[model samples]
Target: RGIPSICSAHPLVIEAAMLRAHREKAPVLIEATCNQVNQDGGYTGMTPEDFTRFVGAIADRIEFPREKILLGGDHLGPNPWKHLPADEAMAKAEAMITAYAKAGFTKLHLDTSMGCAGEPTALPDATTAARAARLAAVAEDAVLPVYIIGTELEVTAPEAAIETVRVHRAAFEEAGAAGAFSRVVGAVVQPGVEFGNENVIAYDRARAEKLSATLGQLHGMVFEAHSTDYQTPDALRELVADGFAILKVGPGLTFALREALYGLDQIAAFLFPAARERTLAEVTEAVMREEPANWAKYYHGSAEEQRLQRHFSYSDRIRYYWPHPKAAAAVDELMSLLDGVAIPETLISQFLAGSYARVRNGEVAPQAKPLALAAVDAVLQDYFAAC
Candidate 1:
């Protein structure tokens, strides 16, 4: 079987959620991020203090002690290092890894795959060594069980995947990594797929199976499946049977919430006349305030646009956003749709409840603050009501 999963906003929230899941006898995996300070200096990125606080919170929430939660520095891109020279990249990585260890994170996956295509100077080996040395230094001081992972391989050809994994493994081991694996977390090996399609790339399953089998032969390392979308339960069961231990599923769960929120946005657009005058930003903020009247206009406009194309749509603005007694029934429908799949209690990430536009821009805006707080309150209310 597969491991259970948990999802949350911050490390502390994740710890609390993980504690709850652990009480049900499940493993917990928490996603932690690096705090890259922005120009404002108000901690635009996730911080070490956040992790320590989360650890403390989890310890406080659980009545019975559980195994230490698996904490991963979610996306460790080398852009922070790329701007520096090779030596400086090494230095920065050392400092970052030290900070993580001091913050109590024991597991890390260095995501150094370059964003821009065709920039050939990928120093995965150098980065792996640098990161590992930093981890080794921390482990030496703290006596902690630190696991180091190398750059994620984003290849498809069997030969390429094999070569990348082979090279990364040697580099990581030499650098003191406990093990190395591919971050091909997305479904890239399935049939009837395109190279750039939103779905995973279609690969010859036979080739993938053979490649994976070969990987299994080497060092007995773990293989992680990232962005596992459009993968049926049977496919997942098969992957597990094939010896892949970690199955990463985040987008699908978030996608479910996204669909529901989109519907809510449509409803808000219809009821509120003010929606036509405001941007998507204002409409979202209004929904967070539970202002169904304002939402109605946005939904109506959406409906009107659809009708012009000979499409009919129903608006649930009143039913979903209003504080009427019937709101409970409407939300039940939303939850029913969201809980259709059995989400493992192990995969936990940030709660990310900010305004649509702000979150899209990768930063919270001043206008979005009220909406973000409202969304949080609504989530807590929904959670308790569902229970």
Candidate 2:
């Protein structure tokens, strides 16, 4: 069977995924990337230890078994410090890797594919594997297991995939960590699935046939599909059937969360006109405008087009601003305003139409919290069924 990796740091999203796993009596894999959590507290402002406690608190509140959760560190490399020189950046990556290992992360993706300050954006496989071997050496010293290797270099041919594994295995052996190499249980590959600001490219099995056939050659390892966010259920099932055992989704989850929250905002505007000074969407727009660094480079076009992409893009760049102080307060205010206020079914039908049927059938409450969580769970249900 395949595993769906929920690579997000949002509490509500984590809680919804945990509730789903609790209902299914199945294990859940939650991952945090180097750009999201690291030794220096990447965008989320959480270190590895802080992230462990954050997730633990959520599990306790939901009464979900902590043992059933697989905490994964995704792209654990110098990416967060890529602007620095190679030596300085690698040192930071080593410290970050050690922190993750010490925090008891079960699944570690050793990604050293990005080049440092004076080098190319993407490095050669030989240099990449060597750097990854170094990071694995650090993790081994700090005590770790169940590693994942490689990055972006999407391989459509079986020989390329086989050679990737071969080179990394040889690198590990040369570094005297042959045992660790045996524990390398997964490899990251594109598998031709991705999403841009406005479009989604679905998984095409025909293009990936040769790569899928390489599964039989890997001893005990499996392919980790990156950016498998917007794939249809049939495409996802095909991915698993083809041996891409680990499906990763981050932006997709947050995208669902934003949809529900915005819907609730609209309902609030119609019901309580003078409830707040600014709408949740307005506050989010203000925060994003104040700090344009996150989406500025990614979104292009005129002012109106950029504004639309800021909120509705498939890239979900708004995710970065959710943790902002003003944005967080606006969401909190929205939830509190709608708390226990029985929103009419008509209002939900007009705004949060996706959850209207579930509310009418008594599957989910027509309240703020449940509706928001339901939105995320709806997206997750498809993933679970596919897996």
Candidate 3:
């Protein structure tokens, strides 16, 4: 019954969705990230107060037992704060968790991946132990469940990934984690990488099974799959059979909407330097007003050529140019591919308009207000039926 979706902290909608999911006997996952964006468009630490308000709103809306809602503090540590001393980063993470528990989040993921980001190094055993201790202390006070997440699973070798999880597990237990999830990848099958078609899922399943076997001697710890997208239904089922209880899917859902709105070809073109760099006004005049000449002038081609190409592309040229039907399928196709996968639903919805919205709203520049918004809106609607 659970729709199995997640999003950035939107209090009202999440409360409603959680309540609905509870009634329907579905699991609802909510994401809270400690990586807040600064005015300069970089990430900074998040305030516990901001997280508290959001959690309180969700609690108010759902009216379910706190345990029914799984709250994750997503992508903590190691990325933006990687340059900081380990103690400094750890202190910030501890503070964030304290704030979340004080604010009313009962279930949390102590994300420590950023600590190892861009380096071939594993999360230090000492660091893991320290974090585990902090999380345990917090849980003891909060009377909540705390889950620990290690570095990204995809990039690490299976043995190395297992070692990282084992170290974190030992540290968390010593410190007081209820359980731990293996590393996380952004999506199930990454876009550019050419691992086996089932590489991501396969890796997850292997690690999950191994973890379950190892942890069985102690109290069992749950294994979580992070960044689950681009996997086939069969792959998901394999993961479930191996004992993956939690799954996280984010950017894929957003990209799915993007693909639908612009058509894969147009999106690809737009992402290209020549097209994406255009002023919003220029894009608007071209798409909304049908002024190919103006749009083309920005590109390296004549206006007439641009117009003809646009017409052909929109008409039947795409069939010849990009014949892959996978380019335009609904976002649900990707979701459905994981239908039999046993992991609890943890869906990430596409942010409506996203970067495109910023451009259209003149947050960046104001050249094509209506056209830019229209393009983004069209894509969002195609992907998100309810939101």
Candidate 4:
């Protein structure tokens, strides 16, 4: 009925998702956003080609079937270069789309809703559709036609018809920009589910009832829910039942990973104090303090409040730093310290109380990697059940 899209590029998260998919015998959707993977190496310093190779290598390690892996491009648009003028920004997006298509990414999410330089914050539906059509031509020509995901739905609607969807089914078929309507699979929509630095918003079915009641109005297109990270299993289940089938979780996976890393750091410090001369927590904090570029704008408050949120916020801003040279070195040392050492159930119960029961029940191994993987898998298991 539904599937969880593993949206993080971290190796452990990818491995955890692949292993869960393998155990469940289901296809896994792994996506790289425009900001995560692009022609210019957005932030992870990896292009579209590099992302596929990296994911492939992880699949090879787990012996997962190659054919079952599904890679997607999320928020594929001019977002990265929106500050530039429209011509320059659209040109940049075209190149990025070319890279993704040439690299053979089958699932394409061509979103061109945001306004470019000198434009309003959001453009009209017709303008948005035209830009999306321009990109669609690029994609349709580059390595054949990939399945487009509900590209720019508002084009079919009048300026006000979006709020009145069931009335415009025929218009969509007629508008049909670059065969977009024919290939429309699902549309992206906000289902009253989102998360920020401090608070987690839960899904309310009553609020979304009107949104999901018209599934068949547009060729049975399902709703693709973004920012679905950190949702409860019950909420996720209700989402799937409501026709929000594609659940995308990114920071939540890294949030779980940071929890395990902090838990293991405490265990390492407890077992070998001299070895942890500089605790992983302290090292990460020091790096965060020295380089506040990634988390600075997203977090706000007093010095102490921001410090705590830097490492423990639900936003998981610490995820941006895990690949930092210093942060990676610190994590390597933490893993090496706890490599063969059997972590005590009591310490795990004390620090990582969420994962203690699994370790106690012998479901997860009492080692560094396995325990961390189990923590990530625990989050995935909820979505697996909900799906």
Candidate 5:
């Protein structure tokens, strides 16, 4: 079966994924990107070792088998420091990759896709292939066998792309790194599924049919589709049925989390209005406004329009604020406020309609944490079904 890489650092999201995988007796793949858990500690403040242990801790709590779990690094390359020159950026990327392989992350995606300082935003595939080969050399020397997934700079890069698998082969062969090619099991490609603050580009099998056909040119390799956050269950099924089996779900999971948390916020406002002066939603807005650096560029419009996107964008840039002290405290306080307090089925139906049926049927407990986890599981269930 296919594995959906749960690409999030949120504890509840990870727990939801773990519980789902355990319940289904399916292998789970959790991935961290260079911007998430790098050697220098990305936004998550976790190094590779810290991340693996964190996942292990979750597994321990859920009694999930470690042997059945696969850890991966996504976009593990110079992207984190692409602002620097190629050499310096690559040095940092090398360290990050070595840390991932050393920490036993078996699935490696080396996307040297971003251009370095003053370079074109997207580089040539020959340039990308050469740079990825450099990272491959590091993986090749790792003590463990690493499965590499290579994608060019950007999905829309005119001169760069995933296949023409021959491009990579020739580039690697020219550099005497051909043997590393055998370990590559997949390549990242645009599957015509993308989303923005207000719109979703649903899967158009017709547009991607040619792209999907390219997979047949290479054996033992499939396609990995990213930004697969808002795809429909049917779209995801078509993706897998067409050999783009490795689905990566990131912001969508967190967006679902936000939906549950927001519903709970409304419930709290209704039940305990006098308990707190400010609601969790207010706190999230405060934190985001206080730190516009993370989201300002991605969310555009007038003050009101930008505010809506801050909380409800398909990109879910709000995720960056979850770790902020105010946001974290708000979550804790909200959960505590509703802790063990039975959420009426009416409230669940009104606010969290997606989980209402499950709550009514006693499939998910009508409690704060349970409701949030269940919301995430709702999304996870779709990916599992498609896979």
Candidate 6:
């Protein structure tokens, strides 16, 4: 069976996932990236321990069983400190995974494929596996975890996929961590699915057919497909059937949330025209413009095109700014504006067409916050259904 990895720290996304897991009596895997949570307090200003508490708090608030939550660390490597020398970066990464292990994270994805200062951008598979084994040794010492090896390299061939597993397994054994290697459950591979600023590459099972066939040879392992964000329901099912059982999605969930919030922002404007202030979209735009590091390099084009991608791109760089105070306050203002106010179905039908039917059928609320959560859940539904 396939499982969707809810790779976001956003409250609404977490709430939506926990609520779904509670409804279905299934466990949920929630992951945080190296850039999102680390020892140095990566972008989210949260350590691994802090993230664990934060997620537990959300589960408590929603009355969801925390036991059913499997917290995971994604891309737990030196990507955050790649500017430093190899040894220095690996030292930081070692500490990061130690934090993840000590915090009792259920799953760990060790990604050491990226090279550090004075090294090639993409390290050789041998070197990468060695680095991964070194990290695994530290993890084994502190507290072992369910390991996931490999990175986002699209293992397009059966041979490559098998080689990846072989190399990593050998490395782990060389590091005297055959025990750690036994815990390896999944491998991250690009299964012909990804999204960029303006486009999506849908999963083509035929293209990955040979790679999927290699699963049987690998002895109790499944492929974890990263960036399987925007695939259709059928495509997702196909991905699962083809053995990409772990579907990782981050931007897609936030993109759906953004869609609903912007829709609610529209409804708020339509209802309270006189009180029209800085909209959430406008606030996010200003924030991203002022701090371009998150998106500027990822998105390229004319100014107008960049502006459109800033808010609506499938890549959804705007997700980075949602944690900003100004953007958060603007969203709060929008929710307050719609709080206790009767929102017409017509407005929802026009602005939030995706959730309009649910609201009409009384399945989802027309309120801003509920509507936003519903939007994210709608995306999750496809993943759960496929899985």
True-vs-predicted CA distance for residue 85, candidate 1, Å = 2.8
TM per candidate? 0.53, 0.97, 0.50, 0.92, 0.95, 0.97
lDDT-wise, the better of 3 and 4 is 4
Ranking by lDDT: 2, 6, 5, 4, 3, 1
Which candidate order results from sorting by TM-score in descending order?
Answer: 6, 2, 5, 4, 1, 3
Local distance difference test, each candidate: 0.41, 0.90, 0.42, 0.80, 0.85, 0.88
TM accuracy, model 4: 0.92
Per model, how many backbone clashes are there? 34, 0, 12, 0, 1, 0
lDDT of 4 by residue, 1-387 (tens): 787878888899999999999888898889988888999999889999999899999999889887888888998888899999999999989999889989878777878778998799787666676676677667766753334343320112222324323212333434444364456566677667867777888998877776676664545466777877888889989999988888888889999998899899988887889976698999999999999999998889899899879987888888888889999999999998898888888888888888788887878888999988988998999888878
Instruction: Specify the poorest-scoring 10-residue window by lDDT in model 1.
Output: 341-350
Name the lDDT of candidate 6.
0.88
Which should have the higher TM-score, number 2 or number 3? 2
Which stretches in model 5 have alpha-carbon errors above 4 Å? 152-164
Error of 3 at 17 (Å): 6.2
Tens digits of per-residue lDDT, candidate 2, 1-387, equal 889999988999999999998877799999999988988888777999999999999999988888998899998998989999999999999999999999989899999989998799999889899999999888899994799997872445678788888999999989988888889998887688877887877788888887888888898989998888877888889999888989998889999999999999998988898978999999999999999999999989899999999999999989988888899999999999999998888988988888989998999998999999999998898888887
lDDT (Cα, tens digit) per residue for candidate 3, span 1-387:
112335434232355445455545545666655554211222323365555445656576546655666665655443446667766656656555566666655455555544544343555566655665575465456544445455442333445445655566566566544333222211111111112212433344443454445434334344455544444555545544443445544433333333333442233233343533433223422342342332243333566654444432222122211212332232223323323432211111132234444444544232222223333333223222221
Which ten contiguous residues of candidate 6 have the minimum total lDDT? 151-160
lDDT of 5 by residue, 1-387 (tens): 677989998988999998998878788889988888998998778999999999999888878889987898988889889989999999999888889889989888888868999689887778878878878877777754545556531233212334445677777777676678788788887777778887888887777776777766668888788888888899988889887889999899999999999999999999899998799999999999999998988988699999889898888999989989889999999999998899999999999999999987879999999999999999999899887
| Candidate 2: segments with Cα more than 4 A from true spot | 153-155
Which of 3 and 4 is ahead in TM-score? 4
Evaluate candidate 4 by giving its C-alpha RMSD to the native, one decimal.
Answer: 3.4
Q: What would the per-residue lDDT of candidate 6 be over residues 1-387, giving only the tens digit for each residue?
A: 778899988998999988887777799999999989999999888999999999999999988887898999999899999999999999999999899999989799999999998899999999999999999999988873788998762446678788998999999999998998998998987777867777777788778878888899977789888888888899999999888999898889999999999999888877887775777788889999999999988789799989989988898888889888888999888888888886788888899999888998999987778888889989999989987
lDDT of 2 at 353: 87
TM-score of 3: 0.50
Candidate 5 residue 15 Cα shift, in angstroms, is: 0.4
Compared to the true structure, candidate 6 yields what TM-score? Answer: 0.97
